[PDB]
Design a protein around this ligand. Structure first.
Ligand SMILES: [Yb+3]
Ligand SMILES: [Zn+2]
Length: 610
């Protein structure tokens, strides 16, 4: 039973396993480099082990020390996005289970795909620079040498030297700060992560950060101009943690802090232990985009405790998290709301499948990432087709209470481990042994390995969705002489979530006549809404409907923030519209150097530049 991580070039967990990382580095904003030592405590899993391989990507290695002496190592040739393998020759052959510590002196490249360095002008304060990391899926190797596979979990401690006036934070518990003995103009911040974690959860942020407490175990962090708004936006955080604990078991990470990043953060959120990273585009002003916090909170169980063994099994991480996420929202706002969000999710799955094509490999729940950059394959499929499967199993097996019992047992069963889809399925069959006849009715091969929409769509309560579909259909079937019928009162009884779903429904049938779009702005004044999800869909609707007035608005949103979910589709819509094509390409070219490296790369591919 052998499964290898095709995205890693390091020795596999069957050969050796990293148990701990002690990181000592200094952040050099002048050179845009992280410099230090990564001391890995490694345990041999084999007899007579004399060498091992680590993943690296654009790292400059100065030396490798074991037992106080330098040893031979060699960097192989780069393998595109996978980076360069680093083979280290051990001074003494190791016995099985023997542990040694290997200290590697390294320096990162300013072009590290794991990092984004921001000048003072790119921050809210305008006086200090800012640095932030994002390692998922395989960018940790672009920060430090390591076995960059989620099949290996390690604890870590770190000491980070940063300019005196800045603050460093990591996905660990803060363990103090002090002046830097070898440079009085610096501070050394210490950190400790006692719970084993896959390396993609290692995180670092350095900047002029301030904090505010918003719950018994939660501090919100951001630059000063965002603290008050963030504290209010995420005030439901503690109640969500409490519901999540009831669903998945105890929260074992100690603290649950939030860090609101600069606009270029590529994701809505990233589940870094002890410190969730979130996009500032969540600051809608009314806590309406809080499902993203519910999502990152859920990862503290599904993803961080029970982890996908390789990225081919990413749906395990995301499907279960979306499932727990929607239950948190269900508890907080009602079962009908969980169904509304669930049905919306199906809508997003439809969109993804239509975008890649119904036979495209990336629409499969379990994908083969051999030779595929995880960033290119990344989409809503593992999230929504994964959720769809669990939702279908829930309805098949007896309801939410029964399936939630399986999810808690699942987490408990695989805590602190890395598993595959087969491990999950075996446990599902084990847990529901008395309902195998029912389980044996699901078309596993289609659900897990076939492209396109799932072979079966679950049942969804339609209560909250009905008004959205009805208003969307009125607009789609409307002819010119019906436009006068629409009025701002149409939106009277719609929540922001329904307004968003109304636009999502309409966007699925875009383009609409340009005259309908102008009328929509005239009566609903969508241009005034700053809720990013609604503005995002409204602008795509305008652009795909060929409304030139929307060009500057779409360009502005595409560049002023960098959440991939919004930036990529906007640039793509703008490129597809002939009136804006040249300007979209030109705007990308000009912003490219100061964008997040992964986002820059993906928009480059989307627009077919270079
Ligand atoms: Yb008519
Ligand atoms: Zn997630």
């Amino acid at each position: 039973p052998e499964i290898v991580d095709t995205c890693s070039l390091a020795s596999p967990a069957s050969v050796c396993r990293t148990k701990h990382l002690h990181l000592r580095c200094s952040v050099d904003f002048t050179r845009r480099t992280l410099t230090g030592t990564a001391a890995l405590t490694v345990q041999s899993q084999e007899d007579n082990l004399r060498s091992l391989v680590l993943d690296t990507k654009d790292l400059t290695i100065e030396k490798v020390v074991i037992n106080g002496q330098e040893v031979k190592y060699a960097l192989g040739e780069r393998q595109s996005y996978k980076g360069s393998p680093m083979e280290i020759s051990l001074p003494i052959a190791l016995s099985k289970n023997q542990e040694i510590v290997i200290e590697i002196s390294f320096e990162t490249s300013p072009k590290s795909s794991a990092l984004q360095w921001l000048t003072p002008e790119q921050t809210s304060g305008k006086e200090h620079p800012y640095l932030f990391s994002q390692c998922q899926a395989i960018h940790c190797r672009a920060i430090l040498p390591c076995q960059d596979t989620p099949s290996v979990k390690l604890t870590y401690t770190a000491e980070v030297s940063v300019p005196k006036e800045l603050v460093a934070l990591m996905s660990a518990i803060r363990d103090g700060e002090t002046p830097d003995p070898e440079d009085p103009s610096r501070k050394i911040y210490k950190f400790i992560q006692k719970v084993p974690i896959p390396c993609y959860l290692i995180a670092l942020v350095v900047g002029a950060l301030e904090s505010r407490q918003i719950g018994p175990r939660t501090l919100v962090w951001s630059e000063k101009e965002q603290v008050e708004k963030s504290a209010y936006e995420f005030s439901e955080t503690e109640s969500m943690l409490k519901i999540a604990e009831d669903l998945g078991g105890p929260y074992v990470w100690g603290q649950y802090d939030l860090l609101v990043l600069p606009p270029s953060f590529p994701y809505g959120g990233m589940q870094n232990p002890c410190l969730t990273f979130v996009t500032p585009t969540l600051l809608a002003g009314d806590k309406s985009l809080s499902n993203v916090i519910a999502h990152e909170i859920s990862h503290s169980w599904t993803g961080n405790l029970v982890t996908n063994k390789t990225w081919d099994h990413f749906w395990l991480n995301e499907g279960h998290t979306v499932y727990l996420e929607r239950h948190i929202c269900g508890r907080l706002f009602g079962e009908k709301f969980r169904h509304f969000n669930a049905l919306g999710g199906w809508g997003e799955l439809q969109n993804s499948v239509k975008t890649f094509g119904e036979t495209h490999p990336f629409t499969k729940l379990v994908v083969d990432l051999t030779d595929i950059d995880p960033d290119v394959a990344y989409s809503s499929v593992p999230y929504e087709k994964g959720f769809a499967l669990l939702f279908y199993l829930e309805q098949l097996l007896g309801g939410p209470e029964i399936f939630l019992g399986f999810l808690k047992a699942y987490v408990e069963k695989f805590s602190y481990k890395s598993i595959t889809t087969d491990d999950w399925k075996d446990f599902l069959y084990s847990y529901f042994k008395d309902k195998v006849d029912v389980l044996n009715q699901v078309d596993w091969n289609a659900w897990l390995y076939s492209p396109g929409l799932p072979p079966i769509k679950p049942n969804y309560d339609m209560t909250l969705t009905n008004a959205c579909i009805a208003l969307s259909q009125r607009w789609i079937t409307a002819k010119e002489d019906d436009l006068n019928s629409f009025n701002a009162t149409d939106l009277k009884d719609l929540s922001s979530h329904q307004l968003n779903e109304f636009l999502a429904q309409t966007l699925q049938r875009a383009p609409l006549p340009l005259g309908h779009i102008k009328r929509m702005q005239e009566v609903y004044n969508f241009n005034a809404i700053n809720n990013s999800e609604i503005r995002f869909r409204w602008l795509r609707l305008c652009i795909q409907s060929k409304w030139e007035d929307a060009i500057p608005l779409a360009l502005k949103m595409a560049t002023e923030q960098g959440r991939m979910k919004f930036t990529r589709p906007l640039f793509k819509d703008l490129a597809a519209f002939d009136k804006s094509h040249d300007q979209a390409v030109r705007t990308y070219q000009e912003h490219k150097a100061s964008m997040h490296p992964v986002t820059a790369m993906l928009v480059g591919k989307d627009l077919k530049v270079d």
